[PDB]
Ligand binder design. Structure first.
Ligand SMILES: CCCCCCCC/C=C\CCCCCCCC(=O)OC[C@H](O)CO
Ligand SMILES: CCCCCCCC/C=C\CCCCCCCC(=O)OC[C@H](O)CO
Ligand SMILES: Nc1nc2c(ncn2[C@@H]2O[C@H](COP(=O)(O)O)[C@@H](O)[C@H]2O)c(=O)[nH]1
Lengths: 298, 292
């Protein structure tokens, strides 16, 4: 019923459904306090599941909690490094290193389970690296100006890898089914999200209390409802496919949306940018073949 | 003489010519390019005849008609490459020059059959990555038509030569003599059609001293002349094109060690990326032998 390439279509739809909700349904999703919006998003996911539990799928522990706590902490730290990385580094460049993380994750999966990287798989990762670089090569955007941004990207790559890798390990160890992975991420996320909000954001009743009104709160539940899509499908994808497949599909997801921006809109375009897009598609096609050749072998 | 010996040889004769063109001969950016190559090949032919009568090689009529397309592929290869570079920056010219290694490699499958390893393709992507990064680390349309034409005449040249070499059991020396001899007439046809010949002007431009430079350039080109046909023969049309583009890197790393010119992190990256590419290529050859 739920295994194989079906999960990939879900993560994509829920990413696309979530991409569209933040840029159209929610006008200006560039909030003042990012960690509190995510705390609501995870609270919507939490409330949602308990209602579904009393109409039917998930469990609550003390041993699984002590083993899942690092995953949620990596998750939240993963977002914290990604936010601080993007304050100083332009998105196309951020994508470069975010596509380069696919390579260490792939070789990170070798050191966790054993599935060696096929020669054909590596060509894909080089193609996704190529694709972004050509896409940046087609774009615009003190000594210590570059400097802070590259530190935060290095730490995001390692928490992005340790997050998807160590989650997948504890999933297959405790036979977590999709719903438990979803429940344990959003619930154990609430506490680490609140610690990250108080540590990084400024809480002032005279100022920031007025900034989140009746209308913006409506935005966070709308966004939390959208985030129910991707929340379930990330842990489903990583479970049935791999930590590297999830990393690749996530990198691929951005392309059709960017290609949508090329079809559905009359904004100026670049050959180098249009190239990067089909280079990225060339990347995914080479990857899927790499998968068929691996499966038929053993 | 076979194996990785040809590869070290091609490197030495390239490195020697790079130094000779950049040190011994002051300003080799001459007025008439195909006339310099005609002397360069004129020196290479003379050298072979003296060597034959001291020892070598053969001279035919059937082989000439089959080697003639290879020579024309060469002279046109230079012509498009000159015309490519009139409109395109060197770093980009190299991007496309590296992209030809891919079609040359898949060109060998359609010419001989030895399929492209998945690991071999990674090396070619790494070489493309490297150059794109080297271009991304720099400053500076009709040139693109001529690059599309330099790429195909570079591939048809390297493939058909390696094909006719293996077809007529040409040895290194026969390949050297046939290339240098049959280029002479096609070089002169190309100079007369493209360069401006004026006694009142350009006859003064090639003096006794510049003529001395073209002969110094000719002695240097004997090295790379022998090793190109030796390398393509004992290794491959693809290994030749990889060794050729990889050669540019130690010269680039040389300029960074031996000179105080400005450098960029992107530049140093591209070089070590190119080195990683050679290493990956070296292994894919090892694994290709062990599997097949
Ligand atoms: C601003 C940044 C610009 C960034 C520009 C991109 C840099 C790409 C560098 C390296 C390739 C990635 C590592 C590839 C590792 C080599 C392959 C390898 O390990 O091959 C043996 C393998 O086990 C056989 O399958
Ligand atoms: C403006 C310039 C546009 C060009 C830019 C494109 C850059 C990517 C290059 C080549 C893709 C190669 C496609 C062919 C992939 C075949 C894979 C292969 O040969 O695999 C080995 C085989 O399975 C063993 O049996
Ligand atoms: N697995 C997992 N990933 C999440 C969760 N919520 C959001 N994501 C992350 O959200 C990103 C895609 O979300 P987007 O901003 O496009 O809606 C991915 O990096 C994905 O890992 C969650 O609870 N679990």
């Amino acid at each position: 019923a739920n295994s194989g390439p079906i999960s990939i279509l879900s993560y994509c739809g829920s990413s696309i459904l979530m991409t569209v909700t933040n840029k159209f349904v929610v006008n200006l999703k560039d909030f003042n306090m990012n960690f509190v919006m995510l705390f609501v998003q995870s609270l919507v996911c939490t409330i949602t599941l308990i209602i579904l539990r009393i109409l039917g799928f998930r469990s609550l522990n003390k041993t699984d909690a002590k083993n899942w706590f690092p995953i949620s902490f990596l998750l939240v730290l993963m977002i914290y490094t990604s936010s601080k990385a993007l304050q100083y580094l332009a998105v196309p460049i951020y994508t470069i290193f975010k596509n380069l993380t696919i390579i260490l994750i792939a070789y990170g999966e070798v050191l966790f389970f054993g599935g060696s990287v096929t020669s054909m798989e590596l060509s894909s990762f080089l193609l996704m690296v190529l694709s972004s670089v050509v896409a940046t090569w087609g774009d615009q955007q003190a000594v210590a100006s570059f400097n802070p941004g590259y530190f935060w990207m290095f730490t995001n790559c390692i928490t992005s890898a340790l997050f998807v890798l160590i989650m997948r390990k504890r999933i297959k160890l405790t036979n977590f089914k999709d719903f438990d992975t979803m429940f344990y991420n959003n619930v154990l996320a609430l506490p680490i999200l609140l610690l990250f909000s108080f540590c990084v954001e400024d809480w002032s009743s005279v100022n920031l209390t007025n900034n989140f009104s009746n209308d913006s709160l409506t935005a966070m539940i709308i966004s939390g409802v959208a985030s129910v899509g991707i929340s379930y499908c990330s842990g489903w994808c990583v479970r049935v496919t791999s930590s590297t497949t999830y990393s690749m599909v996530g990198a691929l997801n951005k392309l059709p949306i960017a290609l949508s921006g090329l079809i559905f809109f009359d904004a100026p375009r670049n050959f180098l940018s249009i190239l990067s897009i089909f280079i990225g598609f060339l990347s995914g096609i080479i990857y899927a073949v790499a998968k068929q050749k691996k499966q038929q072998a053993q």
